[PDB]
Amino acid sequence: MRCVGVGNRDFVEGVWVDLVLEHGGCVTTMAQGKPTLDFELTKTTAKEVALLRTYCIEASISNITTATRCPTQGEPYLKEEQDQQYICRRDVVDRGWGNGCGLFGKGGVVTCAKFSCSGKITGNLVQIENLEYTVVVTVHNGVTAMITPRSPSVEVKLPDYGELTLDCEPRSGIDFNEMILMKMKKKTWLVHKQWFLDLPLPWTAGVHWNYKERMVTFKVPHAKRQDVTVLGSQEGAMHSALAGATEVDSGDGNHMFAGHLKCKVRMEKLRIKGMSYTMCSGKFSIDKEMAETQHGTTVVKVKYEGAGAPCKVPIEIRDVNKEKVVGRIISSTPLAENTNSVTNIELEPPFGDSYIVIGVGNSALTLHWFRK
Amino acid sequence: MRCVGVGNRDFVEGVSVDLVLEHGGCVTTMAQGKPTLDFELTKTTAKEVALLRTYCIEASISNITTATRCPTQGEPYLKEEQDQQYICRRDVVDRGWGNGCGLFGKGGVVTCAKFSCSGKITGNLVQIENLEYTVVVTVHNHGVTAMITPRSPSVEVKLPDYGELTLDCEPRSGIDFNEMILMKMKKKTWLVHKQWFLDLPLPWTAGEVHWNYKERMVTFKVPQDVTVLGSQEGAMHSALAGATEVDHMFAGHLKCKVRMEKLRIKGMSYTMCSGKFSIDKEMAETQHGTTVVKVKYEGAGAPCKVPIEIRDVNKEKVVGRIISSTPLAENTNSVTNIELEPPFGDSYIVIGVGNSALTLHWFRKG
Amino acid sequence: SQSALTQPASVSGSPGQSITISCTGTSSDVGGFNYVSWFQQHPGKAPKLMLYDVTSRPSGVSSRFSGSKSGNTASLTISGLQAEDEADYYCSSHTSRGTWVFGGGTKLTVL
Amino acid sequence: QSALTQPASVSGSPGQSITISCTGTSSDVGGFNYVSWFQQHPGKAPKLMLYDVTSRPSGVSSRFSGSKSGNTASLTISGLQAEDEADYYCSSHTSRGTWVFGGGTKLTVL
Amino acid sequence: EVQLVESGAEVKKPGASVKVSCKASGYTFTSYAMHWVRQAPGQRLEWMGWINAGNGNTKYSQKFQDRVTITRDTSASTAYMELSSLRSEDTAIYYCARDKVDDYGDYWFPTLWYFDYWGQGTLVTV
Amino acid sequence: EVQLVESGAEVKKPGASVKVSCKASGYTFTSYAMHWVRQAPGQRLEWMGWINAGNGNTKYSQKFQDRVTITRDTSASTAYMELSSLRSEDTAIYYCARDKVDDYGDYWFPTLWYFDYWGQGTLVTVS
Ligand SMILES: O=S(=O)(O)C[C@H](O)CNC1CCCCC1
Ligand SMILES: O=S(=O)(O)C[C@H](O)CNC1CCCCC1
Ligand SMILES: *[C@@H]1O[C@H](CO)[C@@H](O)[C@H](O)[C@H]1NC(C)=O
Ligand SMILES: *[C@@H]1O[C@H](CO)[C@@H](O)[C@H](O)[C@H]1NC(C)=O
């Protein structure tokens, strides 16, 4: 009873069952002589991630050094020009008596500034082999199961209901050979490998920043001299470029993805707990009023106030004239465990007027139901 | 002696004068029986500017509040929805027996967050009537500041011992300021198109700050939580690639008419220097095909006229021209700046009289 | 500090008789959701979950304890009073705002 | 240590002439004309005596003269007076855009 | 079997801070949220806030958001509750109660049977 | 006329910070740059740095870049100089000197007649 109330819900009926498990959604299975089960893919977690490239999205300039020279004297030199951590640019300015030079004409200048990153983004490789799928299987009245590419088939034991084999194929997630896991401050995305490698920002693999000029302000030749300044923050520019991209959830270690795990369930060793009991003779009462779900089905809680329990709960969906059985019961053979025991039942009444009968004889509870 | 080192320099000669003053430009005026003057446009400052809009380029989210409700029960409410400092959005989620709802279906939700701006950009309206032009007029051998306003274009400039001049100017500009905005971002300033600036998809205000369209910086997307869009500083710098960067230092050439009627040459009232001269500053060629030299008058009988002549290779006839109008030596050990225009090739610059006269060889490549 | 959930301060009852404790809230808690729970607190001991989901009760809790809800008012009914029932009773609710509110408390006295 | 070298003490007789040297490098004194001379009386703030190597402010006497040859700048005081007895510093704007001062020279008048 | 072991009673002076704890035993600590409820002598129970032990997320009551700080130690299966700038009014018994978190690890909606197991409470006198 | 009024003498303990000032009078503060030069008792003058009062840009000496912070108040025509983590060696007289900025606002090259007007200096004593 975990699938009821979930918006994305698929019903699967087979007569060996084929089912597709996705994030945010869950599958309800039905089969003759087999129990009604709920299946859900809880999480797709990636254990380890290998660092590939680190881009700089925010930078600052420090240790500003300038060297000036008079005309005819040659070009000025700074030791910082040979330093890979600094950005150096040359300009040529009007010199003369007013600027402290004995000679008039164009005098050469050089400015250097230490480049420091304050905001970075990482590109990590996600290995499909290390993926772990958490599947929760619940019976109508949950047991957790793990699917790994190394151990895809798993045996799931259910108390009093038997055992099932869950053979799944971890083929989900777009080819991680062409996909990159991009991290930015607190958010994570799954982007294309080529798109990530083509980003026009300074980058490193190991601090030495390759292509720092991608973060440095553009210089126009026919304009007044300016200081060696850097571009603001590419944080917002990045968020604009990630509009189409799929956002990945990241917590306290590991990354959670949106899987699409294809499974084959073996319902051979499964048995219906309830078939071994006789019909309830006593009176029933409504514990929780019957309510319609988002799947055209109804749910009701019944309290068995009679004796002779454990016993089968008698339920039938009759027509407007209360004669023939017209509806269908989703819950596989519901039982009343003991006296004053509460039972949840999923029903599928037809469109329009119908009568849900719970119990036997005069003591039987008759509930009118309309379906729009 | 202001224009001497300036690269963009123009020489203007008349009788008693049409001149165009531009930023980075320098105008040297010459006239017979009138002093040699330097004119320069210092700044184009608008004394009263009007703020049009302030955009948010960097924001942060705080004090997140959520309120849920069951299906059919209506819409949930929060006190923060009435608060202008808060950004609220509505949606629906799956509700049922497990979520504490008696009914199944989509149940209305509302989420609010405290929006705070940490980085803003301003756009000010530039008006041509409020513009103030600062013109500095210097005499050969500090300068006198003058103000030009469209309301008061003509101005009287008094120069001690040199007389007085009338500076009648008219502001002329190509670009339309009615369609232009002065955009400021942290330390840099730009001149952008009015429509382009008003079309910017960012939160904004006019003039404890209320922000219009906070959702242009705030997303409600989750992989329930409020997400910020991050600094738009770099995105702005990318969009300003074509735009013209500004330093109150607007571009536009001021056309002027100067009245040199009341002007007089300080020096004409003195006699020629008899004593010896020495070079204070060696003679140097400028970027305008002219030369400049500082001379120290070591002799007596000052104030007196400095005797300078540009003679030929054979030291016989006067071949060159002197730019600086009748230079004088104020007192003993006084230094004088002189701008000369020697001809192409060999010439001799003679400073002084008789044997004590200083003879300087000069070769003008050209 | 005043609670959003209102309960009578003291409720008395005779042994082997039925008694009811009321818990009035608003449309934002009791009247809005089924997150209505009842707790028993003996002197010196920590609270014990007696009822949850308005009517549901944990395995070890007696059938003598029953729950009800009508509008913004929730009710706890104890049938066939015993001397051990003499304890403080609190009602709780999960609010529209995603918080938990408790009632003022009801001291049950058994005669 | 200062980049500009000046003699610590220079003595002179009244009415006589005296010269104070200031040796720098091709990066300051030998490179630019931003060579200035300052007079500092005991307890008082420095006073600009010479700028642009040779130029002097309006209130400064003609007795004070400046010179430059290579990386060495010179200050000449003609006809010494008792009031001239003060500390003299030379300064220069450098290639790096900084300012350097000399060690100073205490002028003693006999 | 499920059990919550609370820290010992503490006597503090007004204007100081106090840190109380609750150790989880018999269940997966990360799969549950730890709530903090206080009770002054002779007064009602008052909810303070919670901590999702799985991701470290919190939610406090408006009366306690400025003074209360709830933390957790996954390695020791212990949940901490710090109350700064305590006054004479803070003289109360501090109870911890458990509630299961959703299988994904998010604590949006609680389980209908919230506070099924409680700590014996720490008496903090001022 | 032109005058620079310096702040009063201060006695500080080692490991603390000190903030000195200079108020401009008789000239347009925005058009000039404020320099800071220090002098220990019996020692030479040592240049610390400058502030362009027009745009707020600075330049410090390599010996003072980590400890010295120069600020300005355009409204009050006052220039401030803060020296953090004081030591016994910082016991000096702190002089302020003016120099005109270029007409365009940028202080690339100083004026030929730099430090034409000085402040009387603040004696900062470190015990
Ligand atoms: O002290 S006051 O009279 O202001 C308030 C009084 O403490 C409230 N007591 C309730 C009574 C029911 C059991 C739980 C505690
Ligand atoms: O104290 S030490 O002897 O180490 C160094 C001594 O202070 C240097 N004094 C100069 C002398 C010329 C006037 C300016 C100060
Ligand atoms: C908002 O959150 C901060 C902590 O981030 C807190 O200090 C502040 O008091 C909160 N404000 C309100 C109105 O609750
Ligand atoms: C750079 O400047 C910082 C102060 O901002 C200083 O601590 C550091 O030593 C400087 N580095 C170099 C190489 O000068």
Domains (ranges, CATH) in chain D?
Answer: 9-109 (2.60.40.10)
Question: Cβ distance B310 to B348 under 8 Å?
Answer: yes
Among protein residues, the one with the nearest Cα to ligand 1's atom 14 is: C105
Q: Provide the strand spans (E) within F1-127.
A: 3-6, 10-12, 18-25, 32-39, 45-52, 58-60, 68-73, 78-83, 92-100, 122-126
Nearest Cα residue to E35 out of E2, E55, E61: E61
Q: F85-103: b or e for each residue (b if 16 or more CB lie within 10 Å)? A: ebeeebbbbbbbbbbbbbb
What residues in chain E have their Cβ under 8 A from chain B's Cβ atoms?
Answer: 108-109, 112
Nearest Cα residue to E29 out of E82, E93, E74, E59: E74
Nearest Cα residue to A290 out of A334, A349, A336: A349
Using the structure block, give the residue that is written with the tokens 């016994």: F88
Rounded-to-5 percentages of helix, strand, coil across chain E? 5, 45, 50
Paired sense of beta strands A131-139 and D99-101, if any = unpaired
Which residues fall within 8 angstroms of residue D28, CB to CB, at 6 or more apart?
Answer: D3, D4, D34, D71, D92, D93, D94, D95, D100
Substitution target in D67, D95, D96 with the highest count of A β-carbons within 10 Å is D95
Q: Is the dihedral angle over the CA atoms D40, D46, D49, D50 positive or is it negative?
A: positive
Tell me how far apart the alpha carbons of residues A122 and A191 are, in angstroms, rounded to a whole number: 12
Tell me how far apart the alpha carbons of residues B335 and F121 are, in angstroms, rounded to a whole number: 33
Classify residue B121 by burial, with Cβ atoms within 10 Å: 0-12, 13-18, 19+: buried
Residues forming beta bridges with residue B17, ordered by sequence position: none
Total residues belonging to chain A: 372
Whether residue A43 lies within 8 A of chain E, CB to CB, comes out as yes
Using the structure block, give the residue that is written with the tokens 């302020």: F96
Question: Cβ distance C65 to C49 under 8 Å?
Answer: no
Tell me how far apart the alpha carbons of residues F72 and F52 are, in angstroms, rounded to a whole number: 9
Q: Is the dihedral angle over the CA atoms D72, D73, D78, D80 positive or is it negative?
A: negative
Query: Which chain C residues are within 8 Å of B73, Cβ to Cβ?
Result: 27, 32
Ligand 4 center to A63 CA (angstroms)? 6
The phi-psi region of residue C44 (left if phi > 0; otherwise alpha if psi is between -120 and 50; otherwise beta) is: left
Query: Which chain B residues are within 8 Å of C33, Cβ to Cβ?
Result: 70, 100-101
Give the helix/strand (H/E) hosting A58. Answer: strand A49-68
Gaps in chain C (C to N over 2.5 angstroms) fall after none
Paired sense of beta strands A335-336 and A311-312, if any = antiparallel
Question: Cβ distance B287 to B46 under 8 Å?
Answer: no
Query: Which chain C residues are within 8 Å of A340, Cβ to Cβ?
Result: 63
Tell me how far apart the alpha carbons of residues C18 and F94 are, in angstroms, rounded to a whole number: 90
Tell me how far apart the alpha carbons of residues A214 and A229 are, in angstroms, rounded to a whole number: 12
| Structural tokens at position B271 | 């006699």
Which residues fall within 8 angstroms of residue B137, CB to CB, at 6 or more apart?
Answer: B37, B38, B39, B143, B144, B146, B157, B159, B165, B167
Question: Cβ distance B133 to B254 under 8 Å?
Answer: yes
Resolution for this model in angstroms, one decimal place?
2.7
Tell me how far apart the alpha carbons of residues A344 and A342 are, in angstroms, rounded to a whole number: 7
Tell me how far apart the alpha carbons of residues A274 and B252 are, in angstroms, rounded to a whole number: 94
Question: Cβ distance E21 to E78 under 8 Å?
Answer: yes
Tell me how far apart the alpha carbons of residues D89 and D58 are, in angstroms, rounded to a whole number: 20
Which residues fall within 8 angstroms of residue A276, CB to CB, at 6 or more apart?
Answer: none
How distant is the Cα of D18 from the closest Cα of chain B, in angstroms?
18
Among protein residues, the one with the nearest Cα to ligand 4's atom 1 is: A63
Chains with ≥3 CB–CB distances under 8 Å to B = A, C, D, E, F
How distant is the Cα of C52 from the closest Cα of chain E, in angstroms?
5
| Structural tokens at position A28 | 């309800």
| Structural tokens at position B121 | 């950009």
Tell me how far apart the alpha carbons of residues A245 and A199 are, in angstroms, rounded to a whole number: 15
Whether residue D64 lies within 8 A of chain A, CB to CB, comes out as no
The phi-psi region of residue C91 (left if phi > 0; otherwise alpha if psi is between -120 and 50; otherwise beta) is: beta
Angle at A349 between CA A347 and CA A355, to 5 degrees: 105
User: What distance, in Å, lies between the first and last C-alpha atoms of chain C?
Assistant: 31
Tell me how far apart the alpha carbons of residues A30 and A14 are, in angstroms, rounded to a whole number: 7
Whether residue A322 lies within 8 A of chain F, CB to CB, comes out as no
Whether residue D34 lies within 8 A of chain A, CB to CB, comes out as yes
Interface E:D, ≥3 CB–CB pairs < 8 Å: no
Which amino acids bring their CB within 6 angstroms of ligand 2?
D 8, 87, 103-106; F 42-44
Among protein residues, the one with the nearest Cα to ligand 2's atom 4 is: F43
Ligand 1 center to C107 CA (angstroms)? 9
Closest atom of ligand 1 to CA, residue C7: 12
Query: Which chain A residues are within 8 Å of F106, Cβ to Cβ?
Result: 225
Identity at F7, one-letter amino acid code: S
Q: Which CATH superfamily hosts domain E3-124?
A: Immunoglobulins (2.60.40.10)
Comparing alpha-carbon positions, the chain E residue that sits nearest to B96 is E109
Q: Is the dihedral angle over the CA atoms E24, E25, E26, E29 positive or is it negative?
A: positive
F65 lines ligand 4 (CB under 6 A): yes
Total residues belonging to chain B: 366
Tell me how far apart the alpha carbons of residues F98 and F77 are, in angstroms, rounded to a whole number: 13
Angle at B280 between CA B277 and CA B285, to 5 degrees: 110
Q: Which of F37, F38, F39, F43 to mutate to test the pocket of ligand 2 (most atoms within 8 A of CB)?
A: F43
Query: Which chain E residues are within 8 Å of A134, Cβ to Cβ?
Result: 103
Helix (H, G, I), strand (E, B) or coil at B355: helix
Closest atom of ligand 3 to CA, residue E62: 14
Residues forming beta bridges with residue B108, ordered by sequence position: B92
Substitution target in F44, F61, F65, F98 with the highest count of D β-carbons within 10 Å is F44
Question: Cβ distance F49 to F57 under 8 Å?
Answer: no
Cross-chain Cβ contact E115/C49 below 8 Å: yes
User: What distance, in Å, lies between the first and last C-alpha atoms of chain D?
Assistant: 30
Chains A, B: CB contacts within 8 A come to 109
| CATH architecture, domain F3-126 | Sandwich (2.60)
User: What distance, in Å, lies between the first and last C-alpha atoms of chain A?
Assistant: 24
Question: Cβ distance A283 to A314 under 8 Å?
Answer: no
| Structural tokens at position A60 | 């600052």
Classify residue A99 by burial, with Cβ atoms within 10 Å: 0-12, 13-18, 19+: buried
Tell me how far apart the alpha carbons of residues E53 and F72 are, in angstroms, rounded to a whole number: 51
A60 lines ligand 4 (CB under 6 A): no
Substitution target in F112, F116, F117, F120 with the highest count of D β-carbons within 10 Å is F112
The phi-psi region of residue F63 (left if phi > 0; otherwise alpha if psi is between -120 and 50; otherwise beta) is: alpha
| Structural tokens at position E98 | 């458990």
Tell me how far apart the alpha carbons of residues F54 and F69 are, in angstroms, rounded to a whole number: 17
Cross-chain Cβ contact B68/C94 below 8 Å: no
Helix (H, G, I), strand (E, B) or coil at A129: helix
Does A310 sit behind a cis peptide bond, omega within 30 degrees of 0 on the bond before it? Answer: yes
Q: Is the dihedral angle over the CA atoms A282, A285, A288, A290 positive or is it negative?
A: positive
